[PDB]
Every structure is written in structure tokens, then in C-alpha cells.
């Protein structure tokens, strides 16, 4: 059986990568970063409460101008808020009520949402007709859209539930690059600050670092045990942190190909639903299923506070690009802005 | 007062947007949502054609001043847990089992049956965390082909512990009770089991009666009586 010798070839390749990583790591993050004095406690007050969603919210994304944010929900509604003055800038009605993700374009002219209808539709905010209309429907996946993020006004990567990430091209309509290699249910997605790489998480507890330019899986990170739910880069671009269903949040590293710290706690027994990083990268914020977000000192693995404000499961979370505030959505249908 | 003219018009634009979200939520909270489930070729398409006249498939039908939405999810060949937590708060579940598939072993992994996979599916859906109060409207499909297939072959192939003389009544009642036994909690949920065929003329009334019971419970929940 040539498949058996091919499998033992792959097994010794696993062995080589395992001892390469083991010889690669000498000191952890916590041994060399124990000597920095900790933050301590952080008291973030709910500065705003954006209400107007009626069913559960699974998605949120901040603007690059750090003032407008978009949010998606199961009442078929995509709402752009003015986070300073709680005003609803726009309210987009969706053709499919089952949406699991949303993005807000870096230029600010587009939003994209997609869900169980296997289509990450794209909506045009800036219109001469005054209304938000749908511009392109990106129908090429056979599993549900778990994440879709804009690279540019014309390019968008779409994580999907059919194990496949896909670089798209909004002008034509067709996926120029297809990213395969995960074995179950790709759940999340995070773009590099230079937007030339991206990571993704799946339900085989593996985080794969990709390459937008050619379309290959450059690295693979396996340190979890349960299904990865959300993922995020460190702001420097060299590291990323992820969160899975085993109440464990891990900070992996691109340039060393390694896990740096585990941000688990002995008291937490519910799955992370969303993660994000602060502007300096000092804080890691993780949404949770026990209804409240937890802030973590990213360099000491200490919980620096709890953003307890929600009645139901925190589903989505994000820090602004100026680092000013944190918006958390939840299943009780209330965005809260913390500062 | 301490606002501009433009920020004043922004505030009233947001108030109009609030108003339209309120109307659309009141419209969408008075319609009945049903999650249609089942195995492969269980007769789900048959009852879609009965109640009517890629990705998720949604069916709109109305019946006696009640507007229904029925969400077929058979095309979702993915992990069930994520998109099944997206489906809580649904009024009822229409679960489809074909009676005639008791002796049909599965087309893939030939050691395994349709009926025991349908039992495994029913156990996972009924004992779910997200469906602890949801009334399951079980539909038992193809009674006619079950008659011409139980006149010739016994049900002891699928249920050897069954002890009956292979007629229309007791074999169907045994497999009905075998499906009903799959609850851990028989006091929260209410399972509504029906027998039907493609020729059967009125079985949307069964769904209507089950959702009228669920609507009574939700009307009492909305009046504080829970």
C-alpha cells in the first residue's frame, strides 16, 4: 500500500516539525515578560448603549475613522451606527435573515454580510440614489459564511463553513483564489495589517496562515483542543491570538511558528466567541459565553477586569483603529461601547 | 437644544429609522417559524408540496389567518452545532421519518439503517440545549408503502425486540413509541405525532393545532403569566 508509506512520510514530517518547534522555543512569553510591571485593574464604563436590534446580534465591525460601526442581526437588519451620538446612520434590510458575519470597508463605502444562504452579499453605502443597495452577491460557497472581511473596495476574503476560504473580486464576481486545506468548518478570519497575509480558524482546532498573493497555506498552528470560534492579529502583524470552545485563548506567533501564551483561567468553563486586541496590543479582550467580556494583559496572562454588561452571550467585539473604545455586541441585542 | 441643525436632522433620521425597525419587528414577531428537519428522502419534499399547495430553503404558506415560515436545512452539509444554535426561539420543529425505510440499510456504510440514523437525529435534536421547550411535530411518512412492505417482510430486521404479528397498527405504534421514548424530559417538550401519506389530504391542520398550543403558551408568556 503506497498510501501507507505516504502516511508514514507525512507522520515523520509531523515529527520533524514538532522537534523543529521544540528546538525553536527556549523561553516562553511569561518567563521573559514577567519582569514588566502589570497594568492591574481597568475600569471601563459603558459610555454608550446602542439599542434598536430585536433579535440576536452575531456581527459587528468598526469603521477605520473609529466613529461608525456596523452590526448584523437575525431580524434581517444591518445597522450602521454613529457611535459618538448613538444615531442610526443606516438600516439595511437583508434578503436572508440568517447572517453570521458583517464587514465594513476600510474606505467606508461598502458593507458585506453573509450567512446560511452561502452568499456574502455586498452593499453600497455611498449612492447617488440615496439608499443602500446591494452591489454584488458572491455565491460560490456550498457552506455558510462564517466570516468575510474587506481587503480593498474590490477584494474580499470570505471564510466559509465548507472548509474553504476564498479571495473574491467584487468587480467581476468570481473567486480568483480558493484557499483549501482545512478539514472542518472554517469559522473565522483575520487580515494582516499590511493585508498581504491572513489567518483563519476552523473546527479542526487548527489555525492556518495563508497568503493572499499566491494562495497557499504558509503555516499551520495546532495548539487547541476544541473548535476555534474567533481569531485576531496582534497590531504589529507578527503574532495573532485566537479563541476556541474549550474556554482557552491562545496567542500564536507567525515569525516563530509557535504558541506563546495560553490565556485560560481555572474558573472559566464557557467558550470564547470573539477576540480583539487593543491599539498598543497590551490588552487582549475576549468575548465569552458566560455573558461578559474579559480583558487580559496580553504580556502577563492576567485578567485585568471584566466588561460585565450583557444579559446574554457576547457574540462580537472590537476595538477602534485609534484604540479609543470597545464595542461589544451580544445575543440580548444591545451594543455597549466601553471606554 | 445644544445641537446643530444638521445634528438635529440626524437625530430625527435616527428616530425614523427606529420607527421602521419597530414596525418590521412587530411584523416579524407575529409570524410562525418552523424548522423542518428529517433524514435523506424522508418525505420532506412531499410535505413541502402538501403545505404549500443553495443553502437554506425557506417556504412561505398561510393557513387560517396564520402566516408560516418553514426553513428546510437539508442542503447544509456542515457541522450542525453552529447553525443549529442560530435556530432557537423557533415555534415548532417538523421532524420527518419515513415508515417504509425501516428495513432499508443506508446507501453508504451498508451495515447501518435509515431508521436508526433517524432515531440518532431525533435524539440529538430533541435532547438539544437550544430546543428544550420547542414542540416537535413528528410526521410519519409513507404509511402506504409501509403497508405493502410490512405485509411481506417483518419489522424484526430493524427492531428484533419488537414482538407483534406484523399488522398495520401495532408495528407502527411500536416505532412511534420508540421515537417518543427519546426525550430525557417528557414534561417540558410536547411531541405531536401524525401518520400521513402523499395521498393524505389534510395534515397542515395537525401543524396548525400544534402551533396553536405553542401560540397559547407564548401569549401567556407575553402577558406575564408564563
Amino acid at each position: 500500500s503506497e498510501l501507507d508509506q505516504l502516511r508514514q512520510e507525512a507522520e515523520q514530517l509531523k515529527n520533524q516539525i514538532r522537534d523543529a518547534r521544540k528546538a525553536c522555543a527556549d523561553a516562553t512569553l511569561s518567563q521573559i515578560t514577567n519582569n514588566i510591571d502589570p497594568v492591574g485593574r481597568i475600569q471601563m464604563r459603558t459610555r454608550r448603549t446602542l439599542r434598536g436590534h430585536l433579535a440576536k446580534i452575531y456581527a459587528m465591525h468598526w469603521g477605520t475613522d473609529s466613529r461608525l460601526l456596523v452590526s448584523a442581526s437575525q431580524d434581517g437588519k444591518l445597522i450602521i451606527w454613529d457611535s459618538y451620538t448613538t444615531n442610526k446612520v443606516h438600516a439595511i434590510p437583508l434578503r436572508s435573515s440568517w447572517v453570521m458575519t458583517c464587514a465594513y470597508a476600510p474606505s467606508g463605502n461598502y458593507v458585506a454580510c453573509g450567512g446560511l444562504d452561502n452568499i456574502c452579499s455586498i452593499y453600497n453605502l455611498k449612492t447617488r440614489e440615496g439608499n443602500v443597495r446591494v452591489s454584488r452577491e458572491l455565491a460560490g460557497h456550498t457552506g455558510y459564511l462564517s466570516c468575510c472581511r474587506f481587503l480593498d473596495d474590490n477584494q474580499i476574503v470570505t471564510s466559509s463553513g465548507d472548509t474553504t476560504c476564498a479571495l473574491w473580486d467584487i468587480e467581476t464576481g468570481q473567486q480568483t483564489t480558493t484557499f483549501t486545506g482545512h478539514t472542518g468548518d472554517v469559522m473565522s478570519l483575520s487580515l494582516a495589517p499590511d493585508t498581504r497575509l491572513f489567518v483563519s480558524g476552523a473546527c479542526d482546532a487548527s489555525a492556518k496562515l495563508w497568503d493572499v498573493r499566491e494562495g497557499m497555506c504558509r503555516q499551520t498552528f495546532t495548539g487547541h483542543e476544541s473548535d476555534i470560534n474567533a481569531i485576531c492579529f496582534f497590531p504589529n502583524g507578527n503574532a495573532f491570538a485566537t479563541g476556541s470552545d474549550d474556554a482557552t485563548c491562545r496567542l500564536f506567533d507567525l515569525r516563530a511558528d509557535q504558541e506563546l501564551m495560553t490565556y485560560s483561567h481555572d474558573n472559566i468553563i464557557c467558550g470564547i466567541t470573539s477576540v480583539s486586541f487593543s491599539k498598543s496590543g497590551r490588552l487582549l479582550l475576549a468575548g465569552y459565553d458566560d455573558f461578559n467580556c474579559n480583558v487580559w494583559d496580553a504580556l502577563k496572562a492576567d485578567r485585568a477586569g471584566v466588561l460585565a454588561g450583557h444579559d446574554n452571550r457576547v457574540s462580537c467585539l472590537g476595538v477602534t483603529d485609534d484604540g479609543m473604545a470597545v464595542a461589544t455586541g451580544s445575543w440580548d441585542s444591545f451594543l455597549k461601547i466601553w471606554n | 437644544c445644544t445641537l446643530s441643525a444638521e445634528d438635529k436632522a440626524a437625530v430625527e433620521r435616527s428616530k425614523m429609522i427606529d420607527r421602521n425597525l419597530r414596525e418590521d419587528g412587530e411584523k416579524a414577531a407575529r409570524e410562525v417559524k418552523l424548522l423542518l428537519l428529517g433524514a435523506g428522502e424522508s418525505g420532506k419534499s412531499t410535505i413541502v408540496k402538501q403545505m404549500k399547495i443553495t443553502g437554506i430553503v425557506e417556504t412561505h404558506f398561510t393557513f387560517k389567518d396564520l402566516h408560516f415560515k418553514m426553513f428546510d436545512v437539508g442542503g447544509q452539509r456542515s457541522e450542525r452545532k453552529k447553525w443549529i444554535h442560530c435556530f432557537e426561539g423557533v415555534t415548532a420543529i417538523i421532524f420527518c421519518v419515513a415508515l417504509s425505510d425501516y428495513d432499508l440499510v443506508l446507501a453508504e456504510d451498508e451495515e447501518m439503517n435509515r431508521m436508526h440514523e433517524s432515531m440518532k437525529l431525533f435524539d440529538s435534536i430533541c435532547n438539544n440545549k437550544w430546543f428544550t421547550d420547542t414542540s416537535i411535530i413528528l410526521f410519519l411518512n409513507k404509511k402506504d408503502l409501509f403497508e405493502e412492505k410490512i405485509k411481506k417482510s417483518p419489522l424484526t430486521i430493524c427492531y428484533p425486540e419488537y414482538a407483534g404479528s406484523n399488522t398495520y397498527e401495532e408495528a407502527a405504534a411500536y416505532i412511534q413509541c420508540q421515537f417518543e421514548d427519546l426525550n430525557k424530559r417528557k414534561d417540558t417538550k410536547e411531541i405531536y405525532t401524525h401518520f400521513t401519506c402523499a395521498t393524505d389530504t389534510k395534515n397542515v391542520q395537525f401543524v396548525f393545532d400544534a402551533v396553536t398550543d405553542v401560540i397559547i403558551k407564548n401569549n401567556l408568556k407575553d402577558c406575564g403569566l408564563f
Epitope: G130, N131 | S4, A9, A10
Partner: single-chain antibody, 233 residues
């Protein structure tokens, strides 16, 4: 996107006439509306403002309580009901479209206008330092407009607008909120200015920049224009 305006013409003094403006081509139910008039040789002059959903209505203090603005949302048609047509209401009535959310560009699309020939001490007054500037093409120009109160609100938005009227054409929008270009306006235009002092800097002038340039404030109501500077070749 077109705003064709009906009605208008030669009337009797003390008469009544309903001017109309039928929108077609956009979501007019989500747009605020204005009427802005100009005399046959003076600058523009704001008349009224009905908003989306007819909730909030202001008027010019010259004609408050005597005009009547009224929108129709299903048929997408805008009305101005005028009674007792005095001789100071001989003007060119424009149907202006505007929309107010964060990042929006009010006063962007204007109607073709309609002529109607008939035979306030806290208002912030806009002063234009000239009315005629002779400029050769390819030359950098600076048009100045002066306020009487600081237009920098506490939120940060400086509600100053810069319009343009080609001779024979309807007004367009060039600069909204003192520093932001409109869409379709070439990037050679650049307004800037501190509190009460505003300069619109045209650069590399061509033949299509010849016209009269208006500075409107939008801090409060009524909306007040400057005199306007007719640029010449």
C-alpha cells in the same frame, strides 16, 4: 437623479400659486428638502425646509406663516403653496435636495429651477469681499467669504458651504462643511478657513470655473448666503 420643477410664471400681485417639484430617480422619501430662491440680479436666499417624513418644518422669516411647504411621499412630489403673492417674491425658485447623517453631503443636487415673476436680527450674515474678480486661466484663485459669528460648532463641524452657479445653469455643490469636496467636483478646488474667516482656493482655473460662487452657513436657521463673486475671463 433629476428634480424637475413645475408651475411658475407670470401671476398677479396678491395672488396664489402652488409651485411643484416632482422628484424622480432617487429615494426621495429619505431626503430632506429645501426651497432656495434668488433675485434676478442678487444672490440666493433660502425659503423653507421640510425634512424626511414631514416631521420638522422651518421657514424663512420673510415669509413665515404665509408660505406652505408640503411633500408627497408615495408620488415623490414636492410642493410650495404660496398665498398673497407680493412683489418682493419675484425670484428664481430652486428645489434643493439634502440629507443629514454622519458624513453626508447636504445641498448636493439641485433642481433646474422655476421662475416666478410677480408685479431677523440674530441671523448670521455672510459677507463676500468682492463681486467680480478678473482672472486668466491656469491661475490660482482665492475667493474669501466673511462671517459674523464663528461657524465652528462644539462638535467640530464648520457648517459653511461653497456652491457654484455656471451662467445659465443651476447651482451645484463644491465644498460642504468648509473643507470637504462634493462628488463629481474636480480635486483642484480646496476650501479652508478658521473661525469667521473663510477662503475658497481655486487652483488651475479653466473655462468651466467661470460663474458666481456662494457661501451659505448652516449653523442655525435661517440659512444665509453671501452676495456672490462673479468670476470673469
Amino acid at each position: 437623479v433629476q428634480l424637475v420643477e413645475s408651475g411658475g410664471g407670470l401671476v398677479q400681485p396678491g395672488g396664489s400659486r402652488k409651485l411643484s417639484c416632482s422628484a424622480s430617480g432617487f429615494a426621495f422619501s429619505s431626503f430632506g428638502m429645501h426651497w432656495v430662491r434668488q433675485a434676478p440680479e442678487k444672490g440666493l436666499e433660502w425659503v423653507a425646509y421640510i425634512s424626511s417624513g414631514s416631521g420638522t418644518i422651518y421657514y424663512a422669516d420673510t415669509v413665515k406663516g404665509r408660505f406652505t411647504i408640503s411633500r408627497d411621499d408615495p408620488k415623490n412630489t414636492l410642493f410650495l403653496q404660496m398665498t398673497s403673492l407680493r412683489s418682493e417674491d419675484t425670484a428664481m425658485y430652486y428645489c434643493v435636495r439634502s440629507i443629514y447623517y454622519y458624513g453626508s453631503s447636504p445641498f448636493d443636487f439641485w433642481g433646474q429651477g422655476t421662475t416666478l415673476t410677480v408685479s431677523g436680527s440674530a441671523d448670521i450674515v455672510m459677507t463676500q469681499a468682492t463681486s467680480s474678480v478678473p482672472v486668466t486661466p491656469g491661475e490660482s484663485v482665492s475667493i474669501s467669504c466673511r462671517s459674523s459669528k464663528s461657524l465652528l460648532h462644539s462638535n467640530g463641524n464648520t457648517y459653511l458651504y461653497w456652491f457654484l452657479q455656471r451662467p445659465g445653469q443651476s447651482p451645484q455643490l463644491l465644498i460642504y462643511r468648509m473643507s470637504n469636496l462634493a462628488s463629481g467636483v474636480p480635486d483642484r478646488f480646496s476650501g479652508s478657513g478658521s473661525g469667521t474667516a473663510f477662503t475658497l482656493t481655486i487652483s488651475r482655473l479653466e473655462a468651466e470655473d467661470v460663474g458666481v460662487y456662494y457661501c451659505m452657513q448652516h449653523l442655525e436657521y435661517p440659512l444665509t448666503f453671501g452676495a456672490g463673486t462673479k468670476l470673469e475671463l
